[PDB]
């Protein structure tokens, strides 16, 4: 990648499962007679992670647009490898097992996913406001998880009930069919522009679609698709 970056050509980098890299480093270090560090990991995990990651930088001669993939051991996000990777990212995406088993194939947790470029100067004031609202929603849901689990839905206040319903609608609406998912899913893939996504989420937050049942938000694209499906369901 560096040769093409230095000459000015834009580079789309897709490094996959850097956790396998650090695991191989741990194995070779253990075989090398070095002391294990933390859970059997190599003592030079930070040095190696820096040596690899710092080469992935967009420079003034050329820019590298890189996506990285990280495997978390078991489901522990506090493992040394993901923790070290956490400090070398501009945008963080966390996939949770619970969201995956809830049939939400994207499985991205909005509350555990952040991005540096999420700035109204950069992404736009409307996009930033919509993102902040979509986070505060489902932040209320994470706060009320225990209460809904034990007491039930009725104990919440009317505004609390509306926030919980909108949160569940949002988390279902986050699901989206993929063109490469046709192998095991019959749902055709959908490409939703970022402007369309912002419009759909803003309309949902305003109150539009509140009467729509939550199940109509699953395997959908923009809000127009949900409205069309609801109209078809009459």
């Amino acid at each position: 990648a560096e040769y093409f970056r230095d000459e000015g050509r834009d580079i789309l980098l897709f490094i996959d499962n850097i956790f396998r890299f650090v695991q191989a480093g741990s194995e070779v270090s253990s075989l090398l007679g070095r002391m294990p560090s933390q859970v059997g990991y190599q003592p030079t995990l930070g040095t190696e992670m820096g040596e690899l990651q710092e080469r992935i930088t967009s420079t003034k001669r050329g820019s590298i647009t890189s996506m990285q993939a990280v495997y978390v051991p078991a489901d522990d996000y506090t493992d040394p490898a993901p923790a070290t990777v956490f400090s070398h990212l501009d945008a963080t995406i966390s996939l949770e097992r619970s969201i995956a088993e809830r049939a939400i194939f994207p499985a991205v947790d909005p509350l555990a996913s952040t991005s540096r470029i999420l700035d109204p100067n950069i992404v736009g004031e409307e996009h930033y406001r919509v993102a902040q609202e979509v986070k505060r929603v489902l932040q209320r849901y994470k706060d009320l998880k225990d209460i809904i689990a034990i007491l039930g839905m009725e104990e919440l206040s009317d505004e609390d009930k509306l926030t919980v319903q909108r949160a569940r609608k949002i988390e279902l609406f986050f699901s989206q069919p993929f063109t490469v998912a046709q192998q095991f899913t019959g749902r055709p893939g959908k490409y939703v522009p970022v402007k369309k996504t912002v419009e759909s989420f803003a309309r949902l937050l305003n109150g539009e679609g509140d009467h729509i049942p939550e199940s109509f938000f699953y395997m959908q694209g923009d809000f127009d698709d949900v409205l069309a499906a609801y109209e078809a369901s009459q």
Partner: peptide, 15 residues
Amino acid sequence: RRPPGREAYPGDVFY
């Protein structure tokens, strides 16, 4: 006498 890892497992069990 190899160093154990997560769950006392050797670090190369994945390998």
